[PDB]
Structure formats: structure tokens, C-alpha cells
Amino acid sequence: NSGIECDCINPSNWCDGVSHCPGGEDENRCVRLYGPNFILQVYSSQRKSWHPVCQDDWNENYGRAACRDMGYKNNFYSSQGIVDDSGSTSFMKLNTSAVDIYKKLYHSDACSSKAVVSLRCIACGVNLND
Amino acid sequence: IVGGESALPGAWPWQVSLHVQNVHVCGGSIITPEWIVTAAHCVEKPLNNPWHWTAFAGILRQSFMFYGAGYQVEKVISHPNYDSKTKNNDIALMKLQKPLTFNDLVKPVCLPNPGMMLQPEQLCWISGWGATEEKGKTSEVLNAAKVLLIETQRCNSRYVYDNLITPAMICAGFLQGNVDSCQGDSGGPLVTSKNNIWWLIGDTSWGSGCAKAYRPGVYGNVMVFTDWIYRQMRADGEFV
Ligand SMILES: *[C@@H]1O[C@H](CO)[C@@H](O)[C@H](O)[C@H]1NC(C)=O
Numbered sequence: 001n002s003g004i005e006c007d008c009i010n011p012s013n014w015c016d017g018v019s020h021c022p023g024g025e026d027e028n029r030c031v032r033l034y035g036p037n038f039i040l041q042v043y044s045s046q047r048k049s050w051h052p053v054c055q056d057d058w059n060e061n062y063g064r065a066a067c068r069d070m071g072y073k074n075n076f077y078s079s080q081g082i083v084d085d086s087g088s089t090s091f092m093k094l095n096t097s098a099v100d101i102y103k104k105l106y107h108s109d110a111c112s113s114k115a116v117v118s119l120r121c122i123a124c125g126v127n128l129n130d
Numbered sequence: 131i132v133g134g135e136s137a138l139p140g141a142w143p144w145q146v147s148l149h150v151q152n153v154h155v156c157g158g159s160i161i162t163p164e165w166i167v168t169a170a171h172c173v174e175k176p177l178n179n180p181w182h183w184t185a186f187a188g189i190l191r192q193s194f195m196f197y198g199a200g201y202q203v204e205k206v207i208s209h210p211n212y213d214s215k216t217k218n219n220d221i222a223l224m225k226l227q228k229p230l231t232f233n234d235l236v237k238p239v240c241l242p243n244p245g246m247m248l249q250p251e252q253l254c255w256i257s258g259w260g261a262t263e264e265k266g267k268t269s270e271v272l273n274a275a276k277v278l279l280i281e282t283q284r285c286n287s288r289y290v291y292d293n294l295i296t297p298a299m300i301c302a303g304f305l306q307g308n309v310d311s312c313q314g315d316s317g318g319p320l321v322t323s324k325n326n327i328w329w330l331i332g333d334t335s336w337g338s339g340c341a342k343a344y345r346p347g348v349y350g351n352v353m354v355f356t357d358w359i360y361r362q363m364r365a366d367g368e369f370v
């Protein structure tokens with residue numbers, strides 16, 4: 001019995017758009033920033049893994065929506081395409097014909113732009129020296 | 131901070147002084163204009179009520195923290211699985227009534243992302259107004275010092291901390307001592323620089339004494355608490 005704890009739900013019920021835990025923990029941590037280059041990643045319930053988001057057709061309102069999902073509210077700093085350094089082999093591509101952020105993406109083994117989204121929701125980590 | 135040096139303006143713009151009864155109690159880290167990362171042991175009862183607390187940002191000297199410069203705390207959230215006995219999951223969040231204005235003096239630190247690939251002995255910094263010697267008084271000036279990460283397996287050796295380091299904990303400092311956080315630094319930042327960005331990898335939690343050999347500082351593993359932090363900010367974002 002494959003399962004994930006809500007503190008136990010089934011994998012396909014984690015990040016599927018329907019809240020199965022009493023507090024909604026199965027649907028409120030499906031987007032994340034990966035690595036020192038802030039690679040935007042989305043959890044796939046089918047493959048039980050995190051996949052980077054292609055730069056294809058990505059715009060700032062999509063990044064703002066991702067920033068809201070992460071709990072940063074209206075904070076938004078930047079969004080640009082970069083080369084993936086997360087070592088991923090599968091990616092989430094945006095489907096134009098759509099819906100929610102995590103529900104508008106589909107799996108793909110390449111990005112047309114050859115780039116993944118690098119998303120920074122807040123200007124942080126900068127001090128006096130460089 | 132023991133064995134460190136006084137901080138320059140804008141050197142640690144995320145460092146915040148948390149006050150109760152016109153007195154510095156603990157440190158904190160700005161991550162958003164409203165949210166501050168601090169230690170759960172700092173907000174144990176009776177200081178779990180938010181109206182006891184005032185945050186001071188962008189000010190290096192305690193005597194310069196005048197009446198009217200501080201930000202009233204609106205909300206205090208302790209980690210649900212915090213254990214006072216073991217200091218496990220020693221993390222808490224503070225939300226301000228009024229958001230901070232960001233400038234070269236007051237800026238947030240970045241929450242750690244998964245896949246940081248930090249070195250086992252990664253170079254880090256700690257800062258705060260803690261005592262500069264064990265059992266000493268709160269320091270007037272903000273201090274800071276360099277410390278190295280200590281692998282948990284080495285830290286859990288019977289000769290260091292004997293299996294008291296949980297996966298929600300990281301050790302930093304020097305096994306020889308002489309450079310360590312101290313009383314009053316708790317809740318403050320343990321930061322590291324990678325990809326020209328300062329990351330908050332730890333919040334000052336506890337240690338055996340100060341700067342003692344084979345008793346380095348123990349810090350809350352902010353990477354583990356990242357999921358909980360995002361949920362709290364978001365939950366407050368949807369309003370309560
Ligand atoms: C994209 O949207 C279209 C229209 O609904 C749909 O046919 C298709 O399956 C979606 N995803 C993929 C994998 O193209």
C-alpha cells in the first residue's frame with residue numbers, strides 16, 4: 001500500500017487537485033523552488049516525483065500564481081529561463097488550452113525553449129558585499 | 131556571539147532584535163516584509179502571546195532601539211511538534227502588524243531550497259546580540275562570526291553530543307570551540323553564501339555552554355521546516 005502521511009493518503013491523491021487531508025496538506029505543497037538557481041518544480045502524482053517547468057509560454061502571471069501557491073502572497077521578484085542544472089530528465093510543459101497552475105501542465109521529455117523556469121518570489125539574500 | 135566581531139550596517143540586513151519588556155530576548159530572521167523566523171524556545175509560555183513582542187530591524191545597537199522604532203508582533207506560531215525537553219523542531223514564526231520597508235539596511239534572507247549541495251564543512255555565518263562570553267550579558271552591538279558546518283554523524287559522537295542531534299538539527303562551529311553562539315543569539319540566523327545568495331540554513335537553537343571544546347552550537351534545520359513555513363505563510367495569506 002503506497003501512501004503518504006497527512007500528519008496516510010495514496011500517491012495519486014497527493015497533488016491531484018482534490019484535498020484529501022483534513023488540513024489540505026495534500027494540495028498546498030505541490031510547487032517548489034529547487035537548487036541555488038531557483039528552478040521551478042512541480043510534483044507529479046503519477047510519477048511521484050518533482051519535475052522542472054519548461055520556459056515555453058511561461059509568463060509572469062504564471063510565476064505570480066506559483067508564488068502565491070508557495071505562500072509568498074503578492075511578493076514577486078523575477079522569472080527567467082535558464083539551463084536546467086537539477087539533473088532532471090522529465091519536465092512539465094504548459095498546455096495553452098486550459099485552469100490552475102499545476103493542472104495546466106503536462107509531462108514532456110524536452111522543452112522547446114531548451115530552458116526551465118527560474119523563479120524568485122522575493123528579493124532576498126543580498127547584503128553589503130558581493 | 132563569542133569570538134566574533136561587530137557587524138557593519140547592511141552586513142546582516144535580515145537580523146532582527148526581538149524584545150519583551152523593553153529588553154532584548156532573542157534574535158530573528160526576516161524572510162518576508164511580515165514574517166520573521168525565530169526559535170520555538172523563545173516563545174514558550176508565557177511569551178507565546180504576540181503582544182509581548184517587539185521586533186527591531188536595521189539597528190545595530192540595543193541602546194539605539196528607541197521607543198517608536200520597534201515593530202509590534204501580530205502573530206506567534208510555534209512548530210506543532212516542538213519538544214521543550216529535546217529542543218526538537220525548535221522553530222517558530224512571527225508575523226508583524228505592519229510590514230517592514232526594505233532597503234540596504236533591512237532586507238530578507240532567502241529560505242533554503244532543496245538541492246543546495248552544501249559542503250559537509252560548509253562555511254557559515256552567525257550573528258546576534260548574544261553574550262560575548264558564557265554567562266555574560268547581552269551585547270550592545272550586533273556581532274557576527276564565521277563557523278563551519280559539522281556533520282551530524284561526527285556531532286552525534288559520544289564525545290560531542292551523544293545522539294542528541296535529531297534530523298531537525300544541524301551543528302555548526304569548531305570542535306575546539308572559541309567561536310560559537312551564546313545566550314541571546316538564539317532564534318538568530320545561521321546563514322551561508324552560495325551562488326551569490328545568502329541562504330538561511332539554520333536558526334540558533336541550543337548548545338552545552340558557549341564556545342566550549344566539543345560542544346558546538348546546535349541549530350534548527352530550516353530545510354526540514356521549509357514545508358511548514360510555506361504552509362503557515364499561505365494559511366495566513368488566505369486570512370484567518
Ligand atoms: C492539452 O490540452 C488538450 C485540449 O484539452 C488535450 O487534448 C491534451 O490532452 C492536453 N495535454 C496534452 C498532453 O497535450
Ligand SMILES: *C(=O)c1ccc(NC(=N)N)cc1
Nearest residue numbers: 311312313314316336337347
Ligand atoms: C540561545 O540563546 C543559545 C543557543 C545556543 C547556545 N549554545 C552554544 N552555541 N554552544 C547557547 C544559547
Ligand SMILES: [Ca+2]
Nearest residue numbers: 013018020026
Ligand atoms: Ca489530494
